[PDB]
Design a protein around this ligand. Sequence first.
Ligand code: HEC
Ligand code: HEC
Ligand code: HEC
Ligand code: HEC
Ligand SMILES: [Ca+2]
Ligand SMILES: [Ca+2]
Lengths: 329, 324
Amino acid sequence: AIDNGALREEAKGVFEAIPEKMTAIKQTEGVPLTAEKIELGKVLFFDPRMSSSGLISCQTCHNVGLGGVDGLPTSIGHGWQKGPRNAPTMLNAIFNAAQFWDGRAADLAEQAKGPVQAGVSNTPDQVVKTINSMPEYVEAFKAAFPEEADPVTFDNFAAAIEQFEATLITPNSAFDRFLAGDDAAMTDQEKRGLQAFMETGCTACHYGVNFGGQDYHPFGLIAKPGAEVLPAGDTGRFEVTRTTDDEYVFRAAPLRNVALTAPYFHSGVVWELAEAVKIMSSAQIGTELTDQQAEDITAFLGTLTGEQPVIDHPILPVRTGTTPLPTPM
Amino acid sequence: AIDNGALREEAKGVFEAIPEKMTAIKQTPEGVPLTAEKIELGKVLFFDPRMSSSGLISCQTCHNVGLGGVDGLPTSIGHGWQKGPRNAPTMLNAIFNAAQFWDGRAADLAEQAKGPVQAGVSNTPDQVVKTINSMPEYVEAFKAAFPEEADPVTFDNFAAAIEQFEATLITPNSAFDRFLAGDDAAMTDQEKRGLQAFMETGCTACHYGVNFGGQDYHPFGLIAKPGADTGRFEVTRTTDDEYVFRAAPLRNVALTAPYFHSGVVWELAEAVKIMSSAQIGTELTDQQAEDITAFLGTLTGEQPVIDHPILPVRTGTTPLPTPM
Ligand code: HEC
Ligand code: HEC
Ligand code: HEC
Ligand code: HEC
Ligand SMILES: [Ca+2]
Ligand SMILES: [Ca+2]
């Protein structure tokens, strides 16, 4: 066992490296990324005054220094949520065709907007009024949206953030460098894991540029008896189960930077990556791993960690006399 | 009115410009030298929300570098020394404040060497250290920053590193400093009338030196006027001068609403008018209040531009965050 050329050839049939840099989005030549929109989006992403309490920004739950996530079990950040979910990483989110953790199959079907806009309530008006009250924001929106008479809209808020989101990509992980042609980029163990990941059927669901993130499956995590009275490391506390009549579905989690984004699953109840791998060894989904395979895939998944964005923290617009006051709650 | 040379000369006897860059801290002689390794580790810690039991709150949360070094909210509770919720003061130029707390009884204030980060600091220290030790990138950074120490991951060192980072959170070259340094056109006529009124109406009794405050305490604080505008609050003497408040440092005041220890005033103009009162020996005309308000905007310096640190990755034995 262990031919690099064979392994690379096989991995190239199913995965793709993350690009070094994005130049446009929404190619279906798409929409040019521009410095002005990117910078406004960054400002918006870090501004806690876009929340009612004035403490919560996108950066709070999708923290760029912590793998694009908050490292906590669950939160509620978007109107489309039925309940609390683990925050997915913003890193590489631009590549995910499937935009939600879970839903009724037939409802996710005819659903266009992502989490930022889905459904979106009072918020848009409240966001715009907050933006309008600060002249530095108004000036920024006019520069980012030069062809727009009326540029401070919730759609434009969402558009500027999406442009910033497109810069939050993590090229040059060990796996990507292996893929490009560097044999020494991965260990023997990590290569054994790549091989096992591909042969045991994980790729049915975790494939393409993001190793997941593209489609939904009638399978999701549940607690076994006493899960909440058992050691947070303890094996066999949770397992995956097929939903009844396949009617409810979960997105196959995009596994890029997975080593950075514990805890795991839609409920954020698993803290060890090895345990998440063992849980995805299941007769029900059609994957079974030996102890060895589980160990090697775990080591493999560490190679999906890319170069983290280096981001200057923005200086936020000063509030003015009629900026809406934050709510205590 | 407005002999520039004379006004500048007057300002220099009572205020100082913010230095371009700090080189050492704790000069009591050559102080402690600032180093790259310590500043860097201090920045990581400052942004790391895993330093709180909830895993959500970092120093950055309440002292937000993109928001003038503050959270912009009326009050919070961040340090075991607080008697009650207080408006979070700015991190910007805090290094220069000899007075360390919003308020307290004169005596408890008198006996005390440790600032907010360390005062009264419980089980926190062990929890913090355990958390840092569980991540090898932290242990490496601590070894690099404190090379002379066999046991470098301590709560003392956590605070010492953050203190070095804090020393880079300074804001030189405000319009007032540029005027002080010789640029007559750095401030408008109104702003200069404001400087002049600030100096002659007695504000400098308490708001003086490099930070326009931050240096001592006074038996005077903000209280609400009953009712459930403009006459909503007033400054008042404490019950007998045993209870005192720190003269707020006015650097970057334009950026750090809301105002006063309770964070109940939103408009700078109103905070100025509040500080006009015979109680403290100040009295402003309508025109002086307005000129002083414009002037206080010349205290807004160059905001630090900081690369957001990439945090150490947690491991199997990193303590889990608390539901809260
Ligand atoms: C916590 C209180 C959050 C706030 C603040 C923000 N987000 Fe979020 N985000 C959060 C959760 C719990 C989820 C999962 C929702 C679900 O049930 O599917 C999300 C999801 C996203 C995504 C999708 C990522 C993907 O993999 O495709 C994106 C792009 C996203 N969120 C962006 C985002 C923006 C731009 C925010 C500021 C306006 C924001 N989030 C805040 C939790 C929280
Ligand atoms: C389709 C039937 C799947 C196959 C085959 C595999 N996975 Fe999977 N994975 C799938 C879903 C629907 C989910 C989310 C489930 C939930 O309840 O949250 C996942 C999730 C993971 C994770 C967690 C990643 C995260 O960010 O939380 C990991 C580490 C993972 N899956 C690994 C993995 C392995 C190694 C597989 C082959 C053995 C595998 N998955 C197969 C869908 C499907
Ligand atoms: C909100 C939950 C906060 C957290 C998180 C942090 N701080 Fe804080 N800080 C907060 C308040 C309400 C106050 C005033 C305390 C008082 O009543 O006097 C402070 C004060 C400071 C200061 C004093 C600054 C000055 O103007 O001289 C400093 C230097 C400071 N705090 C530092 C600091 C550090 C390093 C933090 C992370 C360890 C941190 N604060 C968190 C509110 C909150
Ligand atoms: C000594 C008795 C003082 C004199 C004279 C002046 N100020 Fe003051 N100031 C003082 C204290 C003790 C405080 C905080 C009190 C509290 O309850 O919080 C302040 C605060 C301010 C502020 C608010 C700044 C903030 O960051 O919250 C401003 C804008 C201010 N002071 C301005 C000001 C002016 C214009 C003065 C001359 C007319 C003046 N102060 C005098 C103490 C004292
Ligand atoms: Ca996660
Ligand atoms: Ca304030």
